[PDB]
Structure 1
Amino acid sequence: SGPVPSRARVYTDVNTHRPREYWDYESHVVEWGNQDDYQLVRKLGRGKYSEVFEAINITNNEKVVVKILKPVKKKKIKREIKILENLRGGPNIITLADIVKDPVSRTPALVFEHVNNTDFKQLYQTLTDYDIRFYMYEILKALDYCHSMGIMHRDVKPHNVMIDHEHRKLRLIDWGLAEFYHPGQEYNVRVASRYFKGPELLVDYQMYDYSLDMWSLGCMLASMIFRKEPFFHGHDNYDQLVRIAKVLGTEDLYDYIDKYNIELDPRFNDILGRHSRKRWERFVHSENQHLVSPEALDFLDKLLRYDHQSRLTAREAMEHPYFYTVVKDQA
């Protein structure tokens, strides 16, 4: 027939057991606030869907991050706002503070709790192998929470992780691509950034789930323990799958197509080729070794799998030995 269906191993029916309004973001009404309450201070950076200002709530001299949305469809704003309000208060989840309108256009603007970013690049020549485990752990907290809240982030990557190194605080931000998981629903593959897309996005398997965030967590992991950025450095969505296959090899790629009966774009049928699965040792060198460990390589292997159902879950991730040291430390 056609593609074999899939279901999340965990948190599957979580949404079906909440009131409709929780995930039906289409029918959610926006409680707007007064942009007059904030004065833009300075610009912090650009972005695909938003320009990001530092701002002051003149109500109370509070520091704040304003993020002027770039125009999508009203149902995408409602989606982002809904999700942020559900996750609000959760571990390492960016806190949505108010919703206003850019006064000279109308483009809505989200207002967030302020988090100092420590230089996403200057924060590299100072990460010890413990730094990585710890922050990896902080991110998994955010992932188990939103999965367990029925939400896939769908855009995990270092740019969307804010770190305050001086105080070991970390916030997973920019939820504009997230979605609610529903069993049997088919999602858009054009999501997440190219270097981080899951195999299921590239082969066009639309009935994916939380475990796509887990694949991206592995692309983050690789690039950071090996100091290779990006790890899977694809020239486009097509090549990106070739770059993965060269590491994971084509045999498991074809087992994964076979078992889900995915229809491979014939474009691939010329460029994937045949490739063995290479042992992680080949990406270890003198400049990155202090961060590689059998613990760390095992854990990476158990995330970077074609078959989305066989990747570690966020919660399974947090029980791995690569975090034993961290787990005991919190206490």
Structure 2
Amino acid sequence: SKARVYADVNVLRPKEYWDYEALTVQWGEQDDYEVVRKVGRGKYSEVFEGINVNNNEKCIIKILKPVKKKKIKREIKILQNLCGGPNIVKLLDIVRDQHSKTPSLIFEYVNNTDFKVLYPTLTDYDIRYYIYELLKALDYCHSQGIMHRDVKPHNVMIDHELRKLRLIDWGLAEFYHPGKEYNVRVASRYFKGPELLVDLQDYDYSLDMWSLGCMFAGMIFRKEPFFYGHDNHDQLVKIAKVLGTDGLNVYLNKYRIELDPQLEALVGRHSRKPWLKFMNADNQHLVSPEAIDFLDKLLRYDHQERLTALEAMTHPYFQQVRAAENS
């Protein structure tokens, strides 16, 4: 398998662009930045609102939990390569403490609105607008030869007052190289594409489009997360109960993948459930024929069949968002 778009980006760019292990980190001054308050955390980092004591401006301080040198370099190089792109979080500095050598990444600040309280209040137009803004970030990083590999609501920061979106946390991102076999232990469970769940390792940018489709399904159907598996096997079962097993079998045969017998047993046999079966009183104002058409073109087993980010942006679902921007 190979990407249908942007496959040669790292083939044509200098090795320095993608050879992140060759990066020499130019460490800044830890004392330039002071923690104010903790705002978030995850398995790999803690995030703090901070202050730059020179200009007394706000920043975000991301203090990394212990990680291999190779992985830190990967995140840094990717952030540097993407810096300035649309809706990409901006890395401003990189520092570490003398005694323990714990690294922190310093980012621009933004007034984030918690997705768990925000999403229930989004209107139809808001969903179209924010998904379009997220697509801009994904088409950009894909065009720069990078797969994010951890798209989920927690990694999409929205300042709802300013209608400003940023795609964050590039710690799981990778450079795309045609034919490369990648680790499938990426993404949050609920956002893992079928390729990860069946051990198809030569995946590509299209992984991010499955994750995006899961977020979009969650928004329009008011179900978060949309596919709620308890472990990775159960995750595939949840997907198969919606998309049906006929399509799964076609996909597995095309890519010459055999499921672990155990997983095969758990998946069983299921008919496809039409997207309209998910409509109800709570979500009805968000569920339109354009929304369903768009969704159906993202949530496909076969990664090669999914819309690219650029194609997604031109779908008529977003026509009003494009018209507003084009003026």
TM-score, with structure 2 as normaliser = 0.98
Aligned to 1:240: 235
Aligned to 1:129: 124
Aligned pair count? 326
| Conservation of the 8 A alpha-carbon contact between 1:80 and 1:178 | yes
| Conservation of the 8 A alpha-carbon contact between 1:102 and 1:108 | yes
SS of residue paired to 2:85: coil
Q: State yes or no: 1:7 paired with 2:2.
A: yes
Q: State yes or no: 1:286 paired with 2:258.
A: no
Aligned to 2:29: 34
| Conservation of the 8 A alpha-carbon contact between 2:10 and 2:176 | yes
Q: State yes or no: 1:167 paired with 2:124.
A: no
| Conservation of the 8 A alpha-carbon contact between 1:68 and 1:102 | no
> What aligned pairs does 1:100-111 form with structure 2 within 5 A after superposition?
100-103=95-98, 105-111=100-106
TM-superposed CA distance for 1:263, in Å, is: 2.5
> What aligned pairs does 1:138-217 form with structure 2 within 5 A after superposition?
138-217=133-212
> What aligned pairs does 1:218-257 form with structure 2 within 5 A after superposition?
218-257=213-252
The match for 1:22 among 6, 17, 41 is 17
Q: State yes or no: 1:67 paired with 2:74.
A: no
**Counterpart Cα distance in 2 of 1:265 and 1:69:** 35
Which residue identity is paired with 1:319? T
SS of residue paired to 2:92: strand
Aligned to 2:299: 304
Per-residue Cα deviation, 1:69-95 (whole angstroms, up to 9, x for no partner): 011110000000000000000000000
**Counterpart Cα distance in 1 of 2:165 and 2:261:** 42
**Bigger proportion of residues as helix:** 2
TM-superposed CA distance for 1:104, in Å, is: 5.1
| Conservation of the 8 A alpha-carbon contact between 2:63 and 2:103 | yes
Per-residue Cα deviation, 1:142-164 (whole angstroms, up to 9, x for no partner): 00000000000000000000000
Aligned to 1:327: 322
| Conservation of the 8 A alpha-carbon contact between 2:86 and 2:140 | yes
**Counterpart Cα distance in 1 of 2:237 and 2:324:** 40
TM-superposed CA distance for 1:103, in Å, is: 4.8
Which residue identity is paired with 1:194? R
| Conservation of the 8 A alpha-carbon contact between 2:120 and 2:222 | no
RMSD: 0.8
SS of residue paired to 2:27: coil
Which residue identity is paired with 1:230? P
SS of residue paired to 2:301: coil
Per-residue Cα deviation, 1:216-249 (whole angstroms, up to 9, x for no partner): 0000000000001111110100010000000000
| Conservation of the 8 A alpha-carbon contact between 1:153 and 1:175 | yes
**Percentage of pairs with the same residue:** 76
Per-residue Cα deviation, 1:124-156 (whole angstroms, up to 9, x for no partner): 232000000000000000000000000000000
Which residue identity is paired with 1:151? I
| Conservation of the 8 A alpha-carbon contact between 2:89 and 2:168 | yes
TM-score, with structure 1 as normaliser = 0.97
Large movers: runs of 4+ above 3 Å: none
| Conservation of the 8 A alpha-carbon contact between 2:300 and 2:306 | yes
**Counterpart Cα distance in 2 of 1:272 and 1:187:** 24
Deviates more, 1:265-274 or 1:99-108: 99-108
SS of residue paired to 1:137: helix
